[PDB]
Subunit: 223 residues, 2 copies
C-alpha cells in the first residue's frame, strides 16, 4: 500500500507516459525490497486505482490520461489550490433525508456543515454535509476549513471504505447562485454522496453544487 | 461459464427477490453451501465474482453484505461493471467512413490519414430523448459498421461479432449550456443545462478504439457510480 505510493512516485519521477512498460515483476520485488504475492497485491490496488494496466504475457504498463485541469471525481482516484469558507457548523438532529442516507435514527446527533469551497481563489462548490456524530466524534471550524477526509483518516484514524455518488444536472437557485457568484438559472452539476467506513457504515452524506465554470471531472473505469 | 457463475447469478436473483438493499447481510458461507449443495471452495469463488462485480462486500469477523447502491433509475456512469438494458433506442443521423478531426485523432491515438467510422445519433429512453452523440471508431480496429449495429449496442457487436476485448476507459465530464443544435435534437431550449461527457474506450492492450462526445438531456438522466 505504501509501496504503491513509491511506485506511483517513481512513475512521476520518471515522467512515464501511458503504455510505457514498468520493470518486470522480479525487478520490482527487489526495487522495493518485498515478497512476490505482496507486490502483486500492491499492483492489484494500482490497477483498481487507474495507475496501471496489465496484460498477461506482455507486462505491466503505466496508465495516464493526457489532459490537464480535471478534478478526479472519485476521491481515491487522485496542485489544485482549494480553500473553504465555513458558513455553518453545528450539532443537530438529522432531517429524515440525512437519517435515511446515513442509515441512522432520528434521535442520533449529526455534525452539519455548510461551506463554500474555492479553487485558485474562484468558487468551486457549495456544499452541505451531514456526519454521524458517534463516528465523526469531533469537528470544529478549523478542521472543517480544510480536508475533512484527511482529519478523519489521519486525525481520528478511521478507515474510509466505499462510496456512492449520484450525479444530477440542473439550474442554480438563488442561494446557490449567490454563494457561487453566478446567476440563478445557469447550469450546475449536483452530486449526492454517501461515504462508508470499511465496516460498511455510512459516515458522511454530502450534497454538493459545483461551479460549472471552474470545475470539470475525470473518472476512470477498468476493464 | 462454470458452476461458480451459475451460483453467482442465483445469488443476485435472491438479492432482487428479497429486495435486499445496501448493508443487508447475506446467508453465511455454510448456508450457501447447503443451499446450492457445493463446496466451500465453489462458494468462495462465487463470492469473489460478486465482490469484483460490486454486488457484495465482505467484512471479516461479521459477514457478507449487499454492496449495490440504494436508489433506482440512475444510469451507471461506468459501462459494464445500465444504459443498454434501459429501453434505449437510437435514431442514426449519420454513419460513414471519414478522416478523423484532429481532436478524434488525438483521442484515438491515430494519424489523421487513418480512416474512422463516424456516428451521429440521438438516443431515447422510453420515448423521450436521452442524449445526442458523436462517436469515432478506428476503422482498422472496428472494421465494419452498419445502420443496424449503430441503432443498437455497438459494444455488443464489438465483443460478440468482432471478438474484441474491451478494456479500460477514461471519462471527462463538463457541465454547460445546450446550444441550438443540441437543444433541437434533445427537444429542449438552448441555454438550458447539459452534462457533456467525452469518453475514450480502450482495448485490453491499451489501444483506443472509440472516442465519443455526448450531451445528455438533464430532465431524463442522472447517474450513479460506485467507488471502492
Amino acid at each position: 500500500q505504501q509501496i504503491a505510493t513509491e511506485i506511483e512516485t517513481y512513475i512521476e519521477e520518471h515522467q512515464l507516459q501511458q503504455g510505457d512498460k514498468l520493470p518486470v515483476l522480479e525487478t520490482l520485488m527487489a526495487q522495493f525490497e518485498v515478497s512476490k504475492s505482496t507486490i502483486t497485491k500492491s499492483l492489484e490496488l494500482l490497477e483498481q486505482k487507474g495507475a496501471i494496466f496489465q496484460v498477461r504475457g506482455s507486462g505491466i504498463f503505466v496508465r495516464k490520461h493526457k489532459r490537464k485541469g480535471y478534478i478526479s471525481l472519485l476521491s481515491n482516484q487522485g496542485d489544485f489550490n482549494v480553500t473553504s469558507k465555513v458558513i455553518e457548523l453545528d450539532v443537530r438532529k438529522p432531517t429524515p433525508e440525512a437519517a435515511e442516507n446515513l442509515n441512522i435514527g432520528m434521535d442520533e446527533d449529526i455534525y452539519y456543515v455548510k461551506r463554500v469551497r474555492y479553487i485558485n481563489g474562484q468558487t468551486l462548490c457549495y456544499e452541505e454535509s451531514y456526519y454521524t456524530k458517534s463516528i465523526v466524534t469531533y469537528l470544529n471550524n478549523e478542521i472543517v476549513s480544510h480536508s475533512i477526509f484527511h482529519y478523519i483518516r489521519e486525525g481520528l484514524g478511521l478507515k474510509i471504505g466505499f462510496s456512492d455518488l449520484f450525479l444530477h444536472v440542473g439550474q442554480l437557485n438563488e442561494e446557490e447562485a449567490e454563494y457561487l457568484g453566478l446567476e440563478a438559472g445557469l447550469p450546475k452539476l449536483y452530486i449526492e454522496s454517501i461515504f462508508h467506513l470499511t465496516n460498511g457504515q455510512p459516515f458522511d452524506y454530502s450534497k454538493i453544487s459545483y461551479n460549472y465554470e471552474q470545475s470539470q471531472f475525470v473518472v476512470q473505469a477498468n476493464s
